[PDB]
Structure 1
Amino acid sequence: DPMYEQFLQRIQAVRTATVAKDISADILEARHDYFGRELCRALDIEYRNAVLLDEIILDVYPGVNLMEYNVPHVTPDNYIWTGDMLLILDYKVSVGHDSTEVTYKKYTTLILPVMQEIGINTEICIIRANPVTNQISIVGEQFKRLFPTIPVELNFARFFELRKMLLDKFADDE
């Protein structure tokens, strides 16, 4: 894939910490996205790369009077509308829980209040893949019920080797 080739080329070329950090960030984003794409495929849901909350409201209630509400402009990775419930979806790729809790608290306090005012039943769902062991952990009782089985086959090895190469190249930096 040119994904890896593009990244191998920037890593080979990079000479300073500050540009390497932007490469590091872009590796983790691509790792996140590859997870989200393989998830949405296995679950047959429309893959999206962030959706503005305002877009989400307007899809589930097109007669919304957007201007009459204070809608925080958060862009979660995706969403599912069941016709009766809204599930806000965030994909994580991580060995730890830290970012799952940060995002869970952020989306709970920023999304749910306006959806409660508008009258949309709403659940914050977060799906996390461990890059090392491939195991999937799910926040979202409604998400679990609607997707008890997740038929993804993942492989994060390219991403690990790119970031291992990047951080070997800058072992004695900061």
Structure 2
Amino acid sequence: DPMYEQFLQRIQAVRTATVAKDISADILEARHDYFGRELCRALDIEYRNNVLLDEIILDVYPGVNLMEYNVPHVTPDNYIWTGDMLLILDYKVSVGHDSTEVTYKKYTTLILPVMQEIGINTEICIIRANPVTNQISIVGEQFKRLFPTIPVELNFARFFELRKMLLDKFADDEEFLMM
């Protein structure tokens, strides 16, 4: 478990609230990426993690003149180009809905206008795993139509253990409390 052992080594050595806070964010990012790999594997789709919107456009429409459009330089996690429709994909790991709503609004308002200008049928798709219950939530009707079941086998226990160890090391640290 080289990813686990690297985190553990960092948790053993950390002494300051600011370095611990970076450890915490790093753990949350790695558990998010773990879900993305596992999800794409279960669905047997190409795994990507942050593709520049400009690059997505060139992949689906090679003859595009990028400079004739105002392309927001967002980096959604992944996409599916069926040949007829573009599914923009972002992974989430959270017990709650709020981060899904933030990214939904952002990618709806920033990606959909230019894609309609370009002429590319696009759907914004956000796939959330609850890290405690392993239940999967999907926004994106065409994604659900393409993938009615998702046979993932998720275990988030090790990410919770690492983060709990770090939070317990700093549970009497006022600074870290705030961060």
With structure 2 as the length reference, what TM-score do the two structures score?
A: 0.96
Shift of 1:48: 0.8
- The separation in 2 between residues aligned to 1:82 and 1:2, in whole angstroms, is 35
- The separation in 1 between residues aligned to 2:115 and 2:104, in whole angstroms, is 16
TM-superposition CA deviations, 1:24-82 (whole Å, max 9, x none): 11000100000000000000111111100000000100000001110000000000011
Shift of 1:121: 0.6
- The separation in 2 between residues aligned to 1:147 and 1:97, in whole angstroms, is 21
TM-superposition CA deviations, 1:144-168 (whole Å, max 9, x none): 0000010100000000000001111
Partner SS for 2:123: strand
Shift of 1:172: 1.6
Unaligned runs of 5+ in 2: 174-179
- The separation in 1 between residues aligned to 2:98 and 2:69, in whole angstroms, is 31
Query: Which aligned segments of 4 or more residues in structure 1 are displaced greater than 6 angstroms?
Result: none
Shift of 1:100: 0.2
- The separation in 2 between residues aligned to 1:57 and 1:126, in whole angstroms, is 19
Unaligned runs of 5+ in 1: none
- The separation in 2 between residues aligned to 1:66 and 1:21, in whole angstroms, is 39
- The separation in 2 between residues aligned to 1:103 and 1:150, in whole angstroms, is 22
Partner SS for 1:111: helix
Paired position in structure 2 for 1:91: 91
- The separation in 2 between residues aligned to 1:17 and 1:116, in whole angstroms, is 46
- The separation in 1 between residues aligned to 2:141 and 2:166, in whole angstroms, is 38
Task: State whether structure 2 residue 158 is matched by structure 1 residue 158.
Answer: yes
Paired position in structure 1 for 2:176: none
Q: CA RMSD in A?
A: 0.5
- The separation in 2 between residues aligned to 1:87 and 1:50, in whole angstroms, is 14
- The separation in 2 between residues aligned to 1:32 and 1:108, in whole angstroms, is 21
